[PDB]
Amino acid sequence: TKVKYPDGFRSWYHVKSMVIQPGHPLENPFGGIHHVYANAEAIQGLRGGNYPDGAVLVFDLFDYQEDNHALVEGKRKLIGVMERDAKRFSATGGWGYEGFGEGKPDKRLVTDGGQGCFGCHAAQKESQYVFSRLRD
Amino acid sequence: TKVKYPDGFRSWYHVKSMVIQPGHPLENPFGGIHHVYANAEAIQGLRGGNYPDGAVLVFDLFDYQEDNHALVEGKRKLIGVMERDAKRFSATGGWGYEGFGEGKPDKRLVTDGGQGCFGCHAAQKESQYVFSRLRD
Ligand code: HEC
Ligand code: HEC
Ligand SMILES: [Zn+2]
Ligand SMILES: [Zn+2]
């Protein structure tokens, strides 16, 4: 019913990264450097299989500072989490969506059952609602 | 005494990332988005422990493209590798240095036994020649 905080996500597989700079549509609140991490079961789905129950993807979002044309990671702003469970999260296409302020377990950001997250991720219906792709 | 290509490095622990843009003093040759990875032995060293022989750090460098206020990962330009062996790599501080063009095992880049890489990393004598720091 509630998405579990993904303890230990930092030791998971790093899928990819991207920088969202001021002026981008997603600036509020997804601006900054973000890294995507996937647990073992999520890798399964990324590689072409079905996503099994228990698959977790994390969007790890850092602020950054521009210093002499380098962008340097600052503080973590939040994580976004998608947890796969076809039964429990059926209202939102089988993924549960949560945000944790500053990456802390006690700071839950979503107040609408995850419908707002779901509304945009629904555009990737064809890829099981996941935008990120494996790269080497 | 060649550095081994670090097979499977992409499933290692992601330490940190940084973006180096035009203007920054290191644009040539390290411009792009880079990610740092570490195997289990290197984490022992990064944690404040000592570095076991067999510790490997990888600098994975990507070109990026500007897309509407986002920087998006493009193609891999190269990986830099530091491989810990106090006796084998005595001449450059106990770390062997190698570059692989586009991350390819066949594209070895280093021609001078690693002297040029070591000359800059030698600035970090007091952290055992490693610039990166663990973060959360
Ligand atoms: C469009 C308006 C979005 C809304 C609202 C949300 N997300 Fe999102 N998300 C979006 C894109 C374009 C991406 C890909 C970023 C990239 O580097 O390519 C993402 C990514 C995620 C991920 C990583 C997995 C993936 O689908 O690629 C997670 C775990 C994720 N998003 C979670 C999430 C949550 C919990 C949201 C509401 C708080 C949410 N997203 C909103 C686009 C959009
Ligand atoms: C200064 C002119 C440099 C030269 C020449 C080389 N490297 Fe380097 N390296 C440099 C910095 C400032 C950093 C840290 C980047 C960051 O995000 O903090 C690095 C990092 C590495 C790493 C990751 C481990 C670490 O020390 O932080 C590796 C594996 C590494 N560098 C390898 C490497 C090799 C193989 C080189 C010659 C081909 C080389 N470096 C040159 C600065 C400089
Ligand atoms: Zn604009
Ligand atoms: Zn700039």
Side-chain angles (χ1 to χ4, degrees):
Chain A
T1 189
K2 277 190 175 308
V3 176
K4 195 54 195 64
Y5 183 79
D7 278 295
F9 72 92
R10 278 285 286 109
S11 72
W12 294 353
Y13 176 77
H14 173 218
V15 173
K16 60 168 309 181
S17 299
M18 179 182 291
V19 184
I20 296 177
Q21 304 170 292
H24 188 279
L26 298 182
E27 176 185 6
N28 171 247
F30 301 125
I33 300 174
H34 71 253
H35 304 302
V36 182
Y37 298 95
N39 69 354
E41 286 72 10
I43 293 157
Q44 188 175 313
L46 289 159
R47 283 189 174 123
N50 297 336
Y51 287 90
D53 294 341
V56 182
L57 290 157
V58 176
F59 183 102
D60 194 4
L61 180 61
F62 276 79
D63 186 44
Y64 63 84
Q65 303 129 344
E66 190 177 3
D67 165 36
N68 192 214
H69 301 116
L71 310 187
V72 171
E73 289 176 322
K75 282 177 77 65
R76 168 174 294 111
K77 293 174 62 182
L78 56 79
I79 68 189
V81 179
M82 281 166 75
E83 177 190 328
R84 186 70 197 172
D85 186 317
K87 296 299 162 189
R88 296 188 289 125
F89 298 122
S90 65
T92 56
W95 293 100
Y97 294 84
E98 179 67 279
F100 299 86
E102 309 184 293
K104 286 165 185 163
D106 47 301
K107 300 199 177 192
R108 295 184 174 256
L109 303 176
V110 167
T111 60
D112 62 348
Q115 286 290 323
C117 306
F118 176 64
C120 180
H121 280 251
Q124 287 292 319
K125 179 153 175 291
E126 322 306 338
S127 312
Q128 302 175 254
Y129 302 109
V130 173
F131 290 89
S132 291
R133 305 279 110 101
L134 279 173
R135 60 146 175 84
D136 285 298
Chain B
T1 68
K2 292 150 53 167
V3 172
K4 295 146 213 55
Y5 183 83
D7 283 289
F9 77 88
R10 282 284 286 111
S11 60
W12 297 356
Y13 174 71
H14 174 217
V15 178
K16 65 170 297 181
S17 301
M18 178 186 288
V19 187
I20 294 177
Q21 303 186 284
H24 184 277
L26 291 177
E27 168 78 12
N28 177 334
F30 297 120
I33 301 172
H34 76 257
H35 305 302
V36 178
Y37 298 94
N39 65 0
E41 286 82 357
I43 293 164
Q44 178 185 340
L46 278 169
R47 264 176 173 158
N50 289 316
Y51 290 86
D53 288 337
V56 181
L57 289 167
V58 178
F59 177 97
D60 189 8
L61 178 64
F62 285 79
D63 190 19
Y64 62 84
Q65 290 142 250
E66 287 101 351
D67 180 7
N68 195 25
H69 302 297
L71 311 183
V72 161
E73 296 169 318
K75 73 185 53 170
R76 173 173 286 119
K77 297 167 72 178
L78 62 88
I79 71 165
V81 181
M82 286 167 66
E83 180 182 327
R84 182 69 186 167
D85 190 311
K87 287 276 179 284
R88 284 194 296 126
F89 295 122
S90 282
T92 49
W95 285 105
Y97 289 84
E98 177 66 277
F100 298 91
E102 303 187 304
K104 278 152 183 185
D106 289 324
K107 290 171 196 165
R108 295 179 179 263
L109 298 174
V110 157
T111 59
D112 60 357
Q115 279 304 305
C117 301
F118 179 56
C120 176
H121 282 247
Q124 284 294 293
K125 208 160 192 306
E126 72 183 57
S127 39
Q128 297 301 109
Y129 308 105
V130 175
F131 289 87
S132 305
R133 297 314 190 236
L134 270 191
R135 61 150 168 77
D136 296 314

